[PDB]
Amino acid sequence: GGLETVQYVRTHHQHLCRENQCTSALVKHIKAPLHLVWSLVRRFDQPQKYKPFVSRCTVIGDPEIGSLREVNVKSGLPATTSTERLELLDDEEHILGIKIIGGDHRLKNYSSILTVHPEIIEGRAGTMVIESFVVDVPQGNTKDETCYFVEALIRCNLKSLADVSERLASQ
Numbered sequence: 001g002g003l004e005t006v007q008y009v010r011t012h013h014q015h016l017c018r019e020n021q022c023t024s025a026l027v028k029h030i031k032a033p034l035h036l037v038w039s040l041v042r043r044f045d046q047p048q049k050y051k052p053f054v055s056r057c058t059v060i061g062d063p064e065i066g067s068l069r070e071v072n073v074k075s076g077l078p079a080t081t082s083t084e085r086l087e088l089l090d091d092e093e094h095i096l097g098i099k100i101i102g103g104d105h106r107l108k109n110y111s112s113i114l115t116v117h118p119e120i121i122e123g124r125a126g127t128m129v130i131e132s133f134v135v136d137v138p139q140g141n142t143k144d145e146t147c148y149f150v151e152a153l154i155r156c157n158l159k160s161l162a163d164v165s166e167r168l169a170s171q
């Protein structure tokens with residue numbers, strides 16, 4: 001199911017990419033009810049409640065579909081700021097899509113789709129999160145390098161999402 005979407009994206013989808021584009025998917029299992037995980041992920045205006053590298057986020061007006069956020073990130077990264085647009089938010093089906101449309105970083109034409117799914121983990125309510133992205137390969141890099149570096153960032157985000165969710169769940 002999870003491993004299945006990951007194999008389809010890394011193979012079929014990667015086959016569909018432009019030569020200067022790459023794509024992958026990450027799966028994370030989280031020992032918390034879907035309501036808790038979804039309540040964190042859906043907050044387009046508050047990524048810093050679980051994304052470890054976001055220092056600041058500004059949204060003017062309601063964080064509704066089509067809005068923009070400006071995020072500042074912590075020191076130590078090849079970036080200081082990113083402007084991102086909310087492309088999709090479906091509270092009934094639990095799907096979130098974003099596109100990065102500006103900033104001083106190296107990710108051009110980055111789009112992500114994140115979905116959240118209910119499951120059982122050791123006889124308890126759990127949640128599976130799948131996040132997939134497509135992004136351009138910056139000039140002097142390869143698809144592999146770009147994918148692995150972006151994957152590291154998403155894994156940090158989903159691990160932190162899991163930690164926060166499971167902490168909240170134990171209450």
Ligand SMILES: CC1=CC(=O)CC(C)(C)[C@@]1(O)/C=C/C(C)=C\C(=O)O
Pocket residue numbers: 051053073077078079080081082100103105106107112150153154157
């Ligand atoms: C942590 C970081 C480092 C960069 O080099 C680019 C950028 C500033 C966009 C970024 O916020 C990337 C965040 C990503 C890929 C996904 C997300 O947050 O859902």
